[PDB]
Design a protein around this ligand. Sequence first.
Ligand SMILES: [Mg+2]
Ligand SMILES: [Mg+2]
Ligand SMILES: [Mg+2]
Ligand SMILES: [Mg+2]
Ligand SMILES: [Mg+2]
Ligand SMILES: [Mg+2]
Ligand SMILES: [Mg+2]
Ligand SMILES: [Mg+2]
Ligand SMILES: [Mg+2]
Ligand SMILES: [Mg+2]
Lengths: 135, 100, 65, 61, 141, 149, 214
Amino acid sequence: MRIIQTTGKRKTAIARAVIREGKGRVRINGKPVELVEPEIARFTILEPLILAGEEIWNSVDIDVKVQGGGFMGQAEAARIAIARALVEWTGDMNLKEKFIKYDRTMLVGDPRRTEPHKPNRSTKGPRAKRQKSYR
Amino acid sequence: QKARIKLASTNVRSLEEVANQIKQIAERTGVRMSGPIPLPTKRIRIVTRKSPDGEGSATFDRWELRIHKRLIDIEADERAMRQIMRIRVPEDVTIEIELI
Amino acid sequence: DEGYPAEVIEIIGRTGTTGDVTQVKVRILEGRDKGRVIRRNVRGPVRVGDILILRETEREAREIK
Amino acid sequence: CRDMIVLPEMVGLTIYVHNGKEFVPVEIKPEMIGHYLGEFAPTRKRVQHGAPGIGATRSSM
Amino acid sequence: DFRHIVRVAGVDLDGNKQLRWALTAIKGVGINFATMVCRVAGLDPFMKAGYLTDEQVKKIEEILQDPVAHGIPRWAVNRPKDYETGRDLHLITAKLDMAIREDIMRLRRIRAYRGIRHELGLPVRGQRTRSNFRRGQTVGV
Amino acid sequence: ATVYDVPGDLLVERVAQRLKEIPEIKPPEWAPFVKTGRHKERLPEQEDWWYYRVASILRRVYLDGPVGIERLRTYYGGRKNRGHAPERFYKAGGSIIRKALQQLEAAGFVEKVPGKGRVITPKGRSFLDKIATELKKELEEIIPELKKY
Amino acid sequence: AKPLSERFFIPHEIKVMGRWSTEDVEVRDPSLKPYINLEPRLLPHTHGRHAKKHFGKANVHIVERLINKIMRSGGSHYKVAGHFMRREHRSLNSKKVKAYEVVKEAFKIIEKRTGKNPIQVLVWAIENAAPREDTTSVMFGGIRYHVAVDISPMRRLDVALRNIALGASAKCYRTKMSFAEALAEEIILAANKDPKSYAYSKKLEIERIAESSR
RNA sequence: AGUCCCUCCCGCUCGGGAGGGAGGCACUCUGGGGGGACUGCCGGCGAUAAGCCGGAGGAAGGGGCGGGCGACGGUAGGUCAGUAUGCCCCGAAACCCCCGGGCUACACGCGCGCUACAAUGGGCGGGACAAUGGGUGCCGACCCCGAAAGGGGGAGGUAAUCCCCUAAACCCGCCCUCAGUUCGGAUCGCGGGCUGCAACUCGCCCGCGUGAAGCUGGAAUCCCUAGUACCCGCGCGUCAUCAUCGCGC
Ligand SMILES: [Mg+2]
Ligand SMILES: [Mg+2]
Ligand SMILES: [Mg+2]
Ligand SMILES: [Mg+2]
Ligand SMILES: [Mg+2]
Ligand SMILES: [Mg+2]
Ligand SMILES: [Mg+2]
Ligand SMILES: [Mg+2]
Ligand SMILES: [Mg+2]
Ligand SMILES: [Mg+2]
């Protein structure tokens, strides 16, 4: 009766994933992963599962709760959490190097955050400024 | 039978000193205490233009005041309640006591 | 017609009016003058091991300091 | 009182409404019911422009 | 069957357009009011205007004569609470033009502020005029 | 199978088709002449838009209940074009939502929790889940991965 | 409209957008070979992690490079085919989902019209549109003159991609053609050395002017 | 999250969901303390010094990234119309109140912006996902009435508890097919509301009607090196009412 929990973060989106023995059902906030839209977000989540292979895919069940951020930020956090759960559950080092060859960020995360704004057209950005005139 | 204690201050050290005094009082007797819980800090931020006139480039000040908080829950016992009523806070700490 | 491939073996330095040109030394890989080493002016970023396609192989750039 | 509303019982009278510097006569007619008095006493003079002076264009500075 | 030109209320209507959009050629009828009258007449707003039969055109004109009596709400007509009769009217074509002209003429007869602004060709609803609303020629210095 | 297992829009379409057999859902008399909010521009183009709005509201109550009028007014608002001024968000009006909720209660699908809002009764939950099961049975014939769920 | 088998499409192998394999694609040009990246990859979206490091754009899949290139307005401060093209609020700036859809539809059209693997046709286009000689400017007596120089492979690739995107952008502007159709037309024409392509004509002009100033 | 009790649903239930209660601090979060990166390791260049260039390991690599803090002086730069202050003036008016006007005028030149000139779209129905802040002269859920703007009652909240608060760009289906148009929405007519002691001069909002210039812009010229620029909305300040602005998200 094993249970494993993992965490993923990506620009204000936080995902908590739980993995256990099962028949191959993956849900994101209660929705089957096959119905996630748009397509560019569905493929972000499915990459580690495809890399792992069908034999490992069909022998587990994963439930992911994710909050904050946007639709692209939420998919990437879920992808990080799922990858970490997969490497911890099976504990095989061939897979861990395979994830790193394909995409390092799957396992070390992404530390980038927004930069705070500054005066002179503060609402647009930290570096964008007002048009300058001389006459 | 349990009392709730709230503390607040602009100085982080005095808050900890008063909380530690309470914790020592509770340990110095047989009484159960819900540990000092840190509540989110209040930030008051005010942004102002610097120059008195309107000539020159516009530059701004960002002034900030921070208020820290703690929360302690302990069961009301007369032997220990008098001791926590006898402790006197520094002038920059607010304390309130209520019965729940 | 299809040019001659050459391979970068050394970087010499920047030049041009705004510093946009680099002088390099290349070794011809094909054609009548295979194996010869000549210097050339290149526009764009370049590193050792790049391969250029020359439309002619008898012009050589003036050496810079 | 420039914000007084014209009422039917005021029809036929002549009222002098302040415009800022003097009182102008207004003769109340039936088709004025429902309007403020100030609408009939203009407070600005009509503009007849002269010749643009120095600094009116870029070249004149 | 199909007619490329159908005449309704004294305006020719393109026969290739959907009825709701064909109707907007009439001055005084926009897209919303047209859909309302199409629904009241019990006609599909997406049908081609060329398939109208004579009785349907007669019915449409009857509705356009007095919309309120045919179930169109009073807050939808373009001249509610008429200044002379007090009723809720909808005007189209020439009647609309002369009604608007009479309203402006009444404002001008009493020498009201808005009447003066209408006469001088200047903005009426309180706009600033130092920068914008320029229509003329640059003057020399 | 539950509502959580199928796409929202497809379920709304099926439910809107199904709601035309229930006698207590009849569009009011002013339905032909109104917009669904101050941020819109033209009237609805479907001659049966009332059933779509009612089905959407029922599914909304199923998922987020208990919920009141004001929050639904937030949900059905949107962005408005304001001529020469920049675009802005606005809420929808209240009559459509209130009348739809009252009709749904009259049909026995929702009930009122005092000071909290409206919630889905067991009958309404069964009503939606039946259609969801049928739609899923249809859908999994072309997406074999849906058979696990 | 679009069948449900396309709205909910699920892959099972690592291949470009889950639909096309790049194993049989080969690059003829010896100079461009180590810069066209063709490693297996499912999703062409790398979240801009390559801009920090020097030469880092070398290891970015070529389809993602094309997607980034078309994600633009098009004619901001220079004229393309005789016009500025300022779209502003109706451009594709920072909308990478729509660009992905445009590229996918263009690939499907290419596969339908020519029967070949679309990546191969794209590679042929960029091979034919990459110039080999460029020019630099000097000033004398208040007059500007041109001097011929050579081009590095990375700059060749960049110029080819930009020109293809600009040609596609110009063909759909205020005309009945759509963006995906224009992109397909431009790629096919460049792959066949047809002068009606914007990119191929630009390459010819650049090389001619460079030759006339050796 | 796992474990337990009850209730309600589906393919009739092996299985799969949703609420509530006990119960726990695991996970997220909040905030006190501590660790971690030093050109420390490796190979080159330079002098064998100061340093520079390139690699490993690493969450992070060479001011790690973004901010606060501006030396002795000058600019007879701005401010006595924020307050402090010398001299000169007015001192029954140049001081103190009240009423009505003006700062909102309009042949014209210029700065900074917003909306557009359409398909890299317009409309109609449906489906998704935030963060910063603020609230007792106030925030107001929830119920009722109205087509809308709004109207009548009103729980809880001095706030990690209650409320503002179910963003838009994005995705799916249908209509329009390169046209001064189902592009654009200036101008004006009629009617309905809110704040205020007062809405004409001179406020903001809603419904029906009306439908201007504009089809990509000469010579010139501005901003920006990474979660940056572009694109998209939101909060606070001002504030009885009013945001095409400022500062932030
Ligand atoms: Mg920003
Ligand atoms: Mg919507
Ligand atoms: Mg718009
Ligand atoms: Mg001075
Ligand atoms: Mg001075
Ligand atoms: Mg002024
Ligand atoms: Mg329009
Ligand atoms: Mg007024
Ligand atoms: Mg046009
Ligand atoms: Mg201001």
